[PDB]
Design a binder for this molecule. Structure first.
Ligand SMILES: [Zn+2]
Ligand SMILES: [Zn+2]
Lengths: 173, 442
């Protein structure tokens, strides 16, 4: 299940280069069934007629900014004690390991856990890739009619290229 | 924009001089003759062949233990220590302990918070506080591998009485051919290359003019080229991809300096927004090069140990000085030069980034660090550009240059030029191949 898999992930935010309002993205599509439009089709501010698809360059630059932030957050290495009564927080990995990992140096009977785990970082990157994987969001449509009406209406070969680009912004890093 | 910078009047001013700075026209032969640029390395055969893409704590632990154990093994041989005692073993007689300095909190290290974390091999990684009240002299920082002597009667505290001094690596031993190199002039510069209020890169253009005029043999340019901390980069106000702006910057330099015949050496920074943010960093990727330019341009990693005409250069764009300086504690009298102490630590810890944990926001892949960020030898020249004031100091026989940044805020910065020529073979060995250095204002 995609909704729960990316439930704790941070949503991609990027302010309209024109009106200035912050747009939030969590899926390729915005809305449901028939009135479904690619989230990147229109600004969220109704008095802004600029299409985010016009500022693909600014979005890619923002994704890079964000992705850097996450990778740096992971590498900061904050560790926190699993004992509720200790909760010692440190960036110093202790060389003294117990059977399940670093031994908290405050209380000496609990293991230190990564504050931002590698599994959280990996899920976050997969999310940033999922919200721009147009081909996949389309294959997740049952009827080839619903898809192709949509594919013909918004997903031109060029727009599909724009999405592929954003979707792969991930591996530049 | 860049108003203040372009109206400066200090242009060309020599703010620091080292060696026989006079007696050398700061002109290189350009592309002329034999210019030999070789990237150095520290071989390794300890690391396994299956790596994950996100570090596992057990792996970091491994790298840190080896750091202690490996250096300790050398120090033990040098100072002919007989045995290392486990940190937790109590004794009435003085003991010699091997470990990594650390702080007992998340704050700044102070003479009351020092703890010594032992290696796994002898102490199973245990920690014990260290009392420095009886220690006459000391310079310590978190991450520092040290050998201390003292009394630990209860096994819960070491009253240090002696702190062995760091031992540097030997210098590179030149072959006979290396003595056959002619004088070379090397220019060094570090970003930012644009004032904090503009994206006109006026300072960069001025530096390009300098390169063409002085026609140095080699130019070592440190990033950031497209600074992640620049107001306009951070706010994503730019209207072009980061990668494209980066390539343009590179193009301007490569093209704008074609006529000079100088070999360009680009060193990445953790602030280069378009590039891999984890340290150590791999070389930039730039393919838009003629076949001529390819013989004039080189992309190295960060850090990098580079041999220029037989002279070994230690190169790092990371502000290790500022980071280490903010965490070091000392005590002697007060006739001590802070930077010389910090530079001494870099040369005695054998790493391009000995501080651990690192400054908060410096991302380090420790398994890569282990393989690519060690010092192969004590360099002849160490280029450590920092936010700290520019300088040129001779430390343990190594000329350490901090050319400062080319741009500081909205004001002009500085860059530096070195003159090299390895002297005649015999005599009291060390004859620094670096003859003179100058830090000039852009
Ligand atoms: Zn808008
Ligand atoms: Zn604890």
């Amino acid at each position: 299940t995609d909704e729960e898999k990316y439930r704790d992930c941070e949503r991609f935010k990027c302010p309209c280069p024109t009106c200035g309002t912050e747009n939030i993205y969590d899926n390729v599509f915005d809305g449901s069934g028939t009135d479904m439009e690619p989230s990147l089709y229109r600004c969220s501010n109704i008095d802004c007629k600029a299409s985010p698809l016009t500022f693909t360059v600014q979005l890619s630059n923002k994704l890079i900014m964000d992705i850097r932030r996450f990778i740096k957050k992971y590498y900061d290495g904050w560790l926190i004690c699993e004992e509720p009564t200790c909760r010692n927080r440190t960036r110093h990995l202790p060389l003294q390991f117990s059977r399940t990992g670093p031994l908290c140096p405050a209380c000496m009977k609990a293991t230190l856990q990564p504050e931002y785990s590698d599994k959280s970082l990996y899920t976050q990157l997969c999310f940033y890739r999922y919200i721009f994987d147009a081909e996949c969001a389309l294959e997740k449509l049952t009827t080839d009619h619903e898809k192709d009406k949509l594919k013909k209406q918004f997903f031109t070969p060029k727009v599909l290229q724009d999405y592929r680009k954003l979707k792969n912004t991930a591996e530049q890093f | 924009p860049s108003q203040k910078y372009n109206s400066r009047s200090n242009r060309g001013e020599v703010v620091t001089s080292f060696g026989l700075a006079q007696g050398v026209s700061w002109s290189g032969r350009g592309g002329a003759g034999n210019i030999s640029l070789k990237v150095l390395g520290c071989p390794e055969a300890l690391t396994g062949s299956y790596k994950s893409m996100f570090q596992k704590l057990p792996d970091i632990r491994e790298v840190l233990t080896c750091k202690i154990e490996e250096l300790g093994s050398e120090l033990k041989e040098h100072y002919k220590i007989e045995a290392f005692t486990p940190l937790l073993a109590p004794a009435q007689e003085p003991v010699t302990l091997l470990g990594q300095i650390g702080c007992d909190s998340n704050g700044k290290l102070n003479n009351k918070s020092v703890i010594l974390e032992g290696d796994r091999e002898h102490s199973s990684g245990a920690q014990i506080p260290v009392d420095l009240s009886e220690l006459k002299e000391y310079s310590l920082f978190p991450g520092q591998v040290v050998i201390m002597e003292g009394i630990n009667t209860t096994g819960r505290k070491l009253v240090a009485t002696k702190l062995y001094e760091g031992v540097p690596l030997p210098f590179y031993q030149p072959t006979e051919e290396d003595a056959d190199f002619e004088q070379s002039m090397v220019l060094v510069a570090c970003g930012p290359y644009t004032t904090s209020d503009s994206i006109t890169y006026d300072p960069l253009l001025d530096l390009i003019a300098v390169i063409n005029h002085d026609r140095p043999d080699v130019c070592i340019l440190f990033g950031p080229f497209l600074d992640a901390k620049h107001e306009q980069v951070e706010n994503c106000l730019l209207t072009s991809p980061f990668e494209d702006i980066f390539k343009q910057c590179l193009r301007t330099i490569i093209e704008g300096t074609r006529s000079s015949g100088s070999h360009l050496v680009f060193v990445p920074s953790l602030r280069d927004v378009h590039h891999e943010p984890v340290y150590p960093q791999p070389p930039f990727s730039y393919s838009d090069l003629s076949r001529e330019d390819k013989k004039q341009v080189q992309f190295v990693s960060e850090p990098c140990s580079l041999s220029i005409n037989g002279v070994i250069f230690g190169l790092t764009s990371t502000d290790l000085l500022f980071h280490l300086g903010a965490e070091e504690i000392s005590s002697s009298s007060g006739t001590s030069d802070r930077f010389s102490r910090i530079l001494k630590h870099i040369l005695t810890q054998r790493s391009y980034y000995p501080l651990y944990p690192p400054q908060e926001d410096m991302a380090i892949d420790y398994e890569s660090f282990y393989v690519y960020a060690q010092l192969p030898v004590t360099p002849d020249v160490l280029i450590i550009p920092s936010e700290l004031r520019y300088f040129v100091k001779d430390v343990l026989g190594c000329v350490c240059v901090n050319p400062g940044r080319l741009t500081k805020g909205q004001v002009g910065g500085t860059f530096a030029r070195l003159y090299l020529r390895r002297p005649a073979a015999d005599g009291a060995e060390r004859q620094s191949p670096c003859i003179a250095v100058q830090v000039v204002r852009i």
